Amino acid sequence: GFPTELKPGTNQFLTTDDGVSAPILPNFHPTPCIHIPGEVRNLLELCQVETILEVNNVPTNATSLMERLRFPVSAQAGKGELCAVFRADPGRNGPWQSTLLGQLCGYYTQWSGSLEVTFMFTGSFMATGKMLIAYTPPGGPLPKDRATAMLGTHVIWDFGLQSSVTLVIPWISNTHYRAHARDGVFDYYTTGLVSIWYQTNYVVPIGAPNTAYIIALAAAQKNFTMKLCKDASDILQTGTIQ
Amino acid sequence: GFPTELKPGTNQFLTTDDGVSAPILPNFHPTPCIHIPGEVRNLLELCQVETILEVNNVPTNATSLMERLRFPVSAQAGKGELCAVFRADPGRNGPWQSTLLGQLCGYYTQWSGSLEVTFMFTGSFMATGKMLIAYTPPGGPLPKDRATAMLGTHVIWDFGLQSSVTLVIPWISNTHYRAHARDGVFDYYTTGLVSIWYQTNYVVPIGAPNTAYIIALAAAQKNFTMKLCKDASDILQTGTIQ
Amino acid sequence: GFPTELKPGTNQFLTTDDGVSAPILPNFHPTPCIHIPGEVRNLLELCQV
Amino acid sequence: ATAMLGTHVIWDFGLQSSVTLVIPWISNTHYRAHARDGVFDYYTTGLV
Amino acid sequence: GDRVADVIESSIGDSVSRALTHALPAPTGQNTQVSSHRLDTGKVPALQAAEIGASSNASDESMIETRCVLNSHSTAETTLDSFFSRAGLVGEIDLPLEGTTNPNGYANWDIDITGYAQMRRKVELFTYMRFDAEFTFVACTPTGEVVPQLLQYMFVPPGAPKPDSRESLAWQTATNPSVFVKLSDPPAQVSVPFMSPASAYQWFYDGYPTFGEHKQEKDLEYGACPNNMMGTFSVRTVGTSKSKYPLVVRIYMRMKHVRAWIPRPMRNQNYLFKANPNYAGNSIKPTGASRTAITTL
Amino acid sequence: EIGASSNASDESMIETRCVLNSHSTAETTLDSFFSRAGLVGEIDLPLEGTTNPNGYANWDIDITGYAQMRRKVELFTYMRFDAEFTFVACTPTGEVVPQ
Amino acid sequence: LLQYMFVPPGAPKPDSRESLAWQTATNPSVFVKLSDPPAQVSVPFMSPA
Amino acid sequence: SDRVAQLTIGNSTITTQEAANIIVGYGEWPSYCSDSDATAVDKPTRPDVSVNRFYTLDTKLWEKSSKGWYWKFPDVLTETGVFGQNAQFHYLYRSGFCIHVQCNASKFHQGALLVAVLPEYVIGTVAGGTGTEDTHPPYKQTQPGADGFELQHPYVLDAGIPISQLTVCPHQWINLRTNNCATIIVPYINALPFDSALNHCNFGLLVVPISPLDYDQGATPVIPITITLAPMCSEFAGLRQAVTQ
Amino acid sequence: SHENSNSATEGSTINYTTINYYKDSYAATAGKQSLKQDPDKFANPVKDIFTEMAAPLK
Amino acid sequence: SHENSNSATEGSTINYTTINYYKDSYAATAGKQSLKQDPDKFANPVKDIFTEMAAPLK
Numbered sequence A, B: 001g002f003p004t005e006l007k008p009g010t011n012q013f014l015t016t017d018d019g020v021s022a023p024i025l026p027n028f029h030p031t032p033c034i035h036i037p038g039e040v041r042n043l044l045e046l047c048q049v050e051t052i053l054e055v056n057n058v059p060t061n062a063t064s065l066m067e068r069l070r071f072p073v074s075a076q077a078g079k080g081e082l083c084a085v086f087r088a089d090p091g092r093n094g095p096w097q098s099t100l101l102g103q104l105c106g107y108y109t110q111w112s113g114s115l116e117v118t119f120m121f122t123g124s125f126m127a128t129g130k131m132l133i134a135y136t137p138p139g140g141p142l143p144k145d146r147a148t149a150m151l152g153t154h155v156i157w158d159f160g161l162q163s164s165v166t167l168v169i170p171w172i173s174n175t176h177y178r179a180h181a182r183d184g185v186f187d188y189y190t191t192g193l194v195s196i197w198y199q200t201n202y203v204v205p206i207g208a209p210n211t212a213y214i215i216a217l218a219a220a221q222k223n224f225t226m227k228l229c230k231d232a233s234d235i236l237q238t239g240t241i242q
Numbered sequence C: 001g002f003p004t005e006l007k008p009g010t011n012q013f014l015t016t017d018d019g020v021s022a023p024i025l026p027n028f029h030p031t032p033c034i035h036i037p038g039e040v041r042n043l044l045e046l047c048q049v
Numbered sequence D: 001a002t003a004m005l006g007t008h009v010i011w012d013f014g015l016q017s018s019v020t021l022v023i024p025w026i027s028n029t030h031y032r033a034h035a036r037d038g039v040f041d042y043y044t045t046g047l048v
Numbered sequence E: 001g002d003r004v005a006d007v008i009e010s011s012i013g014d015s016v017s018r019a020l021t022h023a024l025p026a027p028t029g030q031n032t033q034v035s036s037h038r039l040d041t042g043k044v045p046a047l048q049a050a051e052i053g054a055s056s057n058a059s060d061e062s063m064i065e066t067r068c069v070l071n072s073h074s075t076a077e078t079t080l081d082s083f084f085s086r087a088g089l090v091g092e093i094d095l096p097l098e099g100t101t102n103p104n105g106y107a108n109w110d111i112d113i114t115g116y117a118q119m120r121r122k123v124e125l126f127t128y129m130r131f132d133a134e135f136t137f138v139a140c141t142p143t144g145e146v147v148p149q150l151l152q153y154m155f156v157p158p159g160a161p162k163p164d165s166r167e168s169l170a171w172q173t174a175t176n177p178s179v180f181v182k183l184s185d186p187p188a189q190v191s192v193p194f195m196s197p198a199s200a201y202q203w204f205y206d207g208y209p210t211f212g213e214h215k216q217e218k219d220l221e222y223g224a225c226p227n228n229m230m231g232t233f234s235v236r237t238v239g240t241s242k243s244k245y246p247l248v249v250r251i252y253m254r255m256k257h258v259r260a261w262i263p264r265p266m267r268n269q270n271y272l273f274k275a276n277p278n279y280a281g282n283s284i285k286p287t288g289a290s291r292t293a294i295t296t297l
Numbered sequence F: 001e002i003g004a005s006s007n008a009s010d011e012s013m014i015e016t017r018c019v020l021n022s023h024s025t026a027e028t029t030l031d032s033f034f035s036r037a038g039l040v041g042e043i044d045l046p047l048e049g050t051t052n053p054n055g056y057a058n059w060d061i062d063i064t065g066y067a068q069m070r071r072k073v074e075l076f077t078y079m080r081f082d083a084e085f086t087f088v089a090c091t092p093t094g095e096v097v098p099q
Numbered sequence G: 001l002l003q004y005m006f007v008p009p010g011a012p013k014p015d016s017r018e019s020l021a022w023q024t025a026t027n028p029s030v031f032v033k034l035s036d037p038p039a040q041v042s043v044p045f046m047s048p049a
Numbered sequence H: 001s002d003r004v005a006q007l008t009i010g011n012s013t014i015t016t017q018e019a020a021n022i023i024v025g026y027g028e029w030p031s032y033c034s035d036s037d038a039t040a041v042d043k044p045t046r047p048d049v050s051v052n053r054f055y056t057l058d059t060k061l062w063e064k065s066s067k068g069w070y071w072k073f074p075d076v077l078t079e080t081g082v083f084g085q086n087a088q089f090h091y092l093y094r095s096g097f098c099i100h101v102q103c104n105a106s107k108f109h110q111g112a113l114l115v116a117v118l119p120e121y122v123i124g125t126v127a128g129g130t131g132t133e134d135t136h137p138p139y140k141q142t143q144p145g146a147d148g149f150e151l152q153h154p155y156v157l158d159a160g161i162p163i164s165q166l167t168v169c170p171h172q173w174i175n176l177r178t179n180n181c182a183t184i185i186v187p188y189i190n191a192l193p194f195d196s197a198l199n200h201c202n203f204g205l206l207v208v209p210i211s212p213l214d215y216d217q218g219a220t221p222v223i224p225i226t227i228t229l230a231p232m233c234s235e236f237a238g239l240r241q242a243v244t245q
Numbered sequence I, J: 001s002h003e004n005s006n007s008a009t010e011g012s013t014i015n016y017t018t019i020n021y022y023k024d025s026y027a028a029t030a031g032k033q034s035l036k037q038d039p040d041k042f043a044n045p046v047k048d049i050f051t052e053m054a055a056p057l058k
């Protein structure tokens, strides 16, 4: 026979090896493929679709789970009070886990790109108000007041016919990619904080509710990509699935 | 030697693997092939040949086996009475097992195509009559009367010089191919039912038999094909064949 | 299969052997390389310092 | 649910104060005589 | 022939499904363009109307002053094949000596990959999937020891006779495809084509397989699609007498040449059964982590 | 009676639509059907025995002792073919021994 | 028979010989026998830097 | 001029003066099955105007405590008008749909409904609570007909999946301060060219309040949500007697 | 490959596409066969062929 | 290679670059897929497309 020599790696089964294997059914032809709507080609396609961000991730009893999908605003005392805060880290435990972006993110070790959160006001038509939504890049501690938060990237939102506003969390990182951030040394990769403040006040006339909610929708910008495929942190099974 | 590396699959013997094996008799030449009539090239060729469909698959004692090859018709009372019924499923237990189509069908997991059953009347020349042969697509239960069966695909057969008539069971399926149907969830693939009714009546003059038989011949249409080669449900041996 | 014959050396792991090994992460792309001062190409460069 | 099976319009109140329901000509004859109770109901146009 | 106008001018029969969108090449992440201060009336990129159902069209360039960034980060690792063509465990078959399960030296496994959560949660991201697959079989004792035992794997498509014993006539395997291999040999490995009667496999079928009254006793058939049932995988020790060793066969699957349609929400409750999405009602947990207040990290 | 099969087609028995059928006929060729290895012989070489206890055996080449394979080939009267033979050997427990 | 598995930052680290993490549906794993030659693979430059 | 709209099909016309554009699911319009995708050979029947029209099937009341509802297609119509008759007399059916969910209030009411379409919406059960019992949903829950069915656990859509990600499916929101309706056009979605309108429900329509309805005492408290829908490009084949299930 | 012509199908009305590494062609793979068919040889071996539309016996 | 066209992606809107040693194409490697994307199909399936600068509801 022809002279060969076996090298290391021989006989091993590497789960990600892309090779050729003998076909079990020779001359077999599959059922033709008809047209089916909604074909997806790249997971990145799904990452640009906004899903609900559970900013209000506090209630935990079955009957109150739906309350996590929205947070409130109501008439205040004009002292630029804080409405809500959350970390911008998409692949970290917290609000982002509720989004499809966050979940897909779990199957990748590193990510890179700008994010966007669109806030939709669902109060009555007669309700008005101006909010200041801020993004604080790494290094900046949770803003103690509106004056401090205002020093970073922000948007001033005015309620009106357009029910929603978009806060872009631009990619501001020291590295080209960030790994998933968590407490400890990996906080090196944190994206930062997002805080919502009352710019003026939630105002309403006689006859309209004094409290209304805001729904947050999040997704990735078009410069977002992910690399280094990995298994998600969760395994949804306790014993054997029968 | 030349650097190689063994991959999984090494040393395995896959019965359907199409490979090259050393030849035991070098420089051997076979006896030339003379011309022989009846060469077959594709099993589909045989599937278009009609073989007898045992519609009357009820008698089971040795001496009555031949009676399964034919069913009867005779003078009735003009109330559009039922003559016979059977499932159209070709690869299912029942009448089709008697046909060569049904048997070949057993060596394949999936099939697709229209079928045809040609009925030949073998009564005396003086016998006349009109029958209604119906095909009921999936979902329709066994027709309670001729009026119900008439709502599906059918042929009205008139006895005469042409002894036979053909009922085409057109391919009407939701899927491109059907797997063999059987009781249970696989009934999803049933083809439907075929029922034979008296349209008028079997009429005959003084002197001719009051009962005659019909022979059913079945085969596949030219759009019929099969895929996913498998072993037949039967194994015709009990112990070792000596 | 195609006729082969294993020669001595088969299965050995020579630490300086320059061969090909299956890649663990298919279709993976590394972080691009930005410019960094002081690239060295040959140890001889350092020997002249 | 039954009325919905015939010709209809779904009207939404708003800036445009009005909506138009067209009662299209759907008759067996080219012309209808005045309808009334009795055999002349043959010419009725229908209900709204 | 046709003559009345409404017939000549109708669209009845148009098979060309009009598409509002088309794909574009996107081998890298989008770049960032220089942007400057804008102080306009009429132009308002930051304001949206989420009610419409579309996602925000606002970009970095319009919300803050940006620099130019030439982004060459690849989008290659997020393709369907990149994501799915990684072999995972989908089946386990035990062939013990002393036992309650398969003590007779053979076993029949219904081909259903939904018994393992890692793999299952990935595929259930899509409703329909069409793909070929590479199957690898790893066998050893329950200690992971390699023993000199010969095995036979046989694929029994729907309708073929399932072996009922280590000596079944069905093992003659004259048409079914079989693989003969030793535990001492590397893991056996073969390629499997897309075998469904449908154009795609579907991980969800909101319907019943048959017609009729769907009474209580038959409700286990809700969601059963035969188009997804490819058959049985049978394994036996090759002999007329019991094997000397207890064995285990782990089954790995690596999809390749993948196409998928209709993305959907990803499972957020533990899986309980292969055949359905049932979840434990007394343990409905939030999709992710929680905190004490909305104003505190 | 003529001995031919019906020439009637779907098109002439019911009103049909157009269907472009691209279902392959490739898997029903003779090689597709027969080129799948099946068991056709078994030879025992026991130690203690009545059959071949002397360490050797002669098997007349005749593949009709197994029904699965036999029923397939007997569908035809004459057949001309080459063949690939594979021999699987082990102990009666399926154990592999250095023999 | 052994199993080697690469667990990138963020993926669940097995906590036992029977951990669900060994299903290795996305992480790259290598299955090999001590009787086989030494396993060998190629690793890319994976840093975010 | 995007807030106003008129939908006319068959002998039915819908108007709205507070719309939020129209969604065309997965970016494609309904169409008839092509000759190469088709497999069944009988010539289909395409009734046109008598079946592709708007049917107003049901009205639900939105209350401060409502959990949400769902309907199944084509189940909601299998017993209505000429469409239902064709669905019953034929084995094979295929069509698209134009869905128009209506809900209006006043400029002093508030609340937001998520209106979405989820293909192959398989329903699950709570498994006896403990999860040790393999219970299954009854026929009236999987195919509720025109009355629809109320979600028991909207957070997981009664199927172990997060409603927070339902927006990955064709949707619109009815946010009272903005619009009074949702309009979604859906093409035929299946792995086969035709299927049984009886045994298979291609998709489900979900209407779920995400931001609870609220208003002050004195404002009209009865706030209906009405479901109107039209089949598009309906095709039927495999004729025989009528069957209801 | 300049080998021997010792295959069972040398001189067949159907050409094959095979692989082989030996001087004897019967050692070759099964390859792919030609997709020609002739149902009439069995389904319609009549001397005087009769049309579909007509009455088979006239 | 003159093989069979039995891959799951035969007739796809994305061409692949694969390796294979068998007559059946589904036995081939996964290769590389085409990098085309269409986010709009999911993120913006609106009938009447609205610009960025404008007010989405006018």
Ligand SMILES: CCO/N=C/c1ccc(OCC[C@@H](C)CCN2CCN(c3ccnc(N)c3)C2=O)cc1
Residues within 6 Å of the ligand: A024, E111, E112, E113, E114, E133, E135, E153, E154, E155, E177, E178, E179, E190, E192, E201, E202, E203, E204, E228, E229, E230, E233, E274, E275
């Ligand atoms: C010696 C011969 O070696 N033979 C090896 C061999 C390997 C694999 C094999 O067939 C593999 C079939 C898989 C590719 C797809 C399995 N699928 C499809 C979708 N599905 C679903 C869908 C919905 N609900 C549930 N529960 C399950 C599912 O489980 C046949 C033979």
Ligand SMILES: CCO/N=C/c1ccc(OCC[C@@H](C)CCN2CCN(c3ccnc(N)c3)C2=O)cc1
Residues within 6 Å of the ligand: B024, F061, F062, F063, F064, F083, F085
């Ligand atoms: C080291 C050397 O390794 N050598 C291996 C080896 C393998 C096979 C071999 O010859 C194989 C012969 C088979 C291809 C055909 C057997 N045939 C023909 C038809 N026939 C019939 C016909 C009518 N009735 C009965 N009963 C039987 C039948 O049984 C010779 C040598």
Ligand code: NA
Residues within 6 Å of the ligand: A019, A020, A021, A022, B007, B008, B009, E189, E190
């Ligand atoms: Na291989």
Ligand code: NA
Residues within 6 Å of the ligand: B019, B020, B021, B022, C001
């Ligand atoms: Na060989």
Ligand code: NA
Residues within 6 Å of the ligand: A007, A008, A009, B005, C019, C020, C021, C022, G040, G041
């Ligand atoms: Na190597």
Ligand code: NA
Residues within 6 Å of the ligand: B174, E207, E208, E209, H195, H196, H199, H200
């Ligand atoms: Na069905």
